[PDB]
Design a protein around this ligand. Structure first.
Ligand code: GLP
Ligand code: GLP
Ligand code: ZN
Ligand code: ZN
Lengths: 398, 401
């Protein structure tokens, strides 16, 4: 663990620019070479030539419901094995941290599954688990999307105590998506953020003012913008209006997820959001359990999903269930659709989600002191290799 | 001639030049802006007259490409003296900072066009009022589903004989500068080509067209969008519609698509002005879309074949909650655009002048304070209230003070 690694002949993403600069690593952390040189030595124990390729912080996916046959919203015999399988497979997508996401389920499912998915550091076993993202059940009936109507719930009884009874202990929970128009959402948002949980707005028929109120109550994220929310209207902007709002707490950057799989939103939607509020854009996969399996029928929590073509509908409906697009595919599609810089596309998949979760000192950057989680990319942003804590954990067949 | 004409120098002023407010004098001769360094170099001449501007802002005079009348005048009426109504509006809008405009006619029966269109030719600006750049004919070749305030009974389509139907409806087009149409109408391609071949700007509006149909119309020659967001399908993330033109990457290279916005605080909320301005700032054109009741306050009035009731600060088609147009003068729109978007003063001023000038290919003579341009400009205080209006270097309106 004490070895000094030096990555040379590389362009690194630092401060929003690709710099021709070496990356120094020891004990899983990025090192300041000026400080290393003065205090210790100048010669690394190992040099690795990167052939001019790009090193960028490892991707962070804060919304993924499963994959490769695994459905996080199922109380199976070995919940942990399913999480570890997905965590391992998404290394090949450039993902080094993620939030396993559960969808609207009966309380007993939460009680069995939630304690089985704790935080875990990344390594050769797979991407690190940052905590659970619980999407629903405290969401709107009118914008339930693929969530089962039977298991939706409201707050009005006794607000946060109803949420605690539904989910069970929240120690392992990092994010909760809710619809803020629900009665007593204010109390719930306050109680959740007081416990360090990120509150996201989604699956909601709330208007702009209600959404702005929820941000003042503590909300900091929007769940897959444009999907499962009222559209933008010029005399009724809705939640999309948060991207241009000047009525939020001063200095606060509202973050918002976008599914850039080429099916959930057209290029115009990616462009208009990126141009209105670039700093807040967070790429998420919202991947469903059928990710990586091709066509067929599989599950998503309590619902059944029909995948045919590159599109996943709730069976018997034309309601999209989620994406089958890996994160690296989303990064490239975002880049192509918006014409943004490579730096901007890479930041939306790593820096921005890290900032959302308050992790920007340890994840999402190649800054001094941060964890050495990074991907090796060619100029087309195809992932050649994935590193966690300075250790090679995935390498492309080529 | 240059040798014989007087040199006027405006001093103690900030001027809008190259997108920046510069503490720099404005020099004028023969009605056009001159380079002082070159004048001294080639002629060793200084100003024959200096005018101290008290530290105020000089900006190119506003250009309003969509105004249906004002102060009781309705351009879409075949009245006894159509020209007198145009001159009245042209004079009054000098106090709004407007030095050029396009009188706009709404969906009307052919007989109205045949009588009115020939009575409203281009006319240079002066003490008589803002210059008339030509007519803007909005409708009748627009969709029924997004007709907005236009009367259903007088809508028309192209399918019969395309451009010859348009020519028979409007009459001779010599005086016409802009036509708004809905591009999903059958045979719109042929009409767009024939209109642009005659130098007429084609605008897209009052339409249920989708993005690809809108992009096709730009490839055929269309260069404007009529009051973005109003009377068109809303933006959807899997169906962008006409708003999607603001972010399209498949339009002709190097050419800017322009779009009008009514920044009166009633037609669109601040988020809509912000999202458009951030997506495509260079294309934004402020238009008043002013109705004949502009400057009259509440009451009942006309808009072509329709009746309009102004109540509160809102002008509805009588008996409906359908907005007919605005009662906001251009300078009011400029100040509201500035406030609602938080943009720079320069950006607000450019949206009311530079951009409409570029739309109409007039950027070398209007909409700028560049050397060689016409000396049409407004004197503004720091809040962008109009204190005085100049045309061809001559003072043509001044605030009471
Ligand atoms: N996970 C969400 C679904 O819940 C939603 O149904 C779908 C389509 O949303 P929309 O039709 O509102 O764009 O997007 C995502 O997949
Ligand atoms: N001149 C147009 C009207 O024709 C239209 O009805 C109005 C409202 O349009 P919308 O309700 O689609 O925003 O905008 C402008 O006023
Ligand atoms: Zn969702
Ligand atoms: Zn109109």
């Amino acid at each position: 663990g004490a070895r000094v690694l030096q990555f040379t002949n590389c362009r690194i993403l630092r401060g929003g620019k690709l710099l021709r600069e070496d990356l120094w690593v020891r004990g899983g952390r990025i090192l300041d070479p000026e400080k290393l040189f003065f205090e210790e030595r100048r010669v690394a124990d190992e040099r690795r030539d990167c052939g001019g390729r790009i090193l960028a912080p490892g991707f962070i996916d804060v919304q993924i419901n499963g994959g490769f046959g695994v459905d996080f919203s199922q109380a199976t015999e070995d919940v942990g094995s399913g999480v570890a399988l997905v965590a391992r497979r998404i290394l090949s997508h450039g993902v080094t941290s993620f939030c396993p996401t559960l969808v609207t389920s009966p309380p007993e499912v939460y009680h069995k599954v939630v304690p089985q998915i704790p935080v875990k550091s990344g390594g050769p076993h797979g991407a690190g688990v940052l905590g659970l993202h619980l999407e629903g059940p405290f969401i709107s009936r009118e914008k339930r999307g693929a969530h089962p109507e039977a298991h939706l719930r409201s707050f009005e009884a006794d607000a946060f105590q109803d949420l605690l009874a539904t989910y069970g202990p929240l120690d392992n929970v990092r994010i909760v998506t809710l619809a803020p128009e629900l009665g007593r959402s204010h109390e719930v948002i306050r109680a959740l953020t007081a416990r360090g949980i990120c509150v996201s707005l989604g699956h909601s028929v709330a208007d702009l003012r209600a959404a702005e109120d929820a941000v003042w109550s503590g909300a900091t994220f929007i769940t897959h913008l444009f999907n499962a929310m009222l559209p933008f209207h010029h005399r009724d902007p809705g939640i999309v209006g948060l991207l241009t709002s000047d009525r939020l707490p001063a200095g606060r950057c509202i973050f918002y997820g976008m599914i850039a799989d080429g099916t959930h939103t057209n290029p115009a939607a990616l462009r208009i959001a990126h141009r209105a509020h670039p700093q807040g854009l967070v790429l998420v996969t919202d991947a469903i359990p059928a990710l990586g399996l091709g066509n067929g029928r599989h599950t998503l929590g309590q619902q059944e999903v029909e995948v045919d073509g590159l599109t996943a509908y709730v069976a018997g409906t034309k309601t999209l269930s989620g994406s089958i697009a890996p994160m690296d595919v989303c990064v490239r599609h975002f880049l192509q659709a918006t014409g943004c810089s490579m730096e901007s596309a890479l930041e939306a998949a790593s820096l921005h989600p890290a900032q959302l979760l308050g992790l920007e000192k340890s994840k999402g950057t190649l800054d001094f002191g941060a964890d050495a989680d990074f991907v090796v990319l060619d100029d087309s942003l195809h992932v050649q290799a994935t590193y966690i804590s300075g250790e090679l954990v995935w390498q492309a067949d080529a």
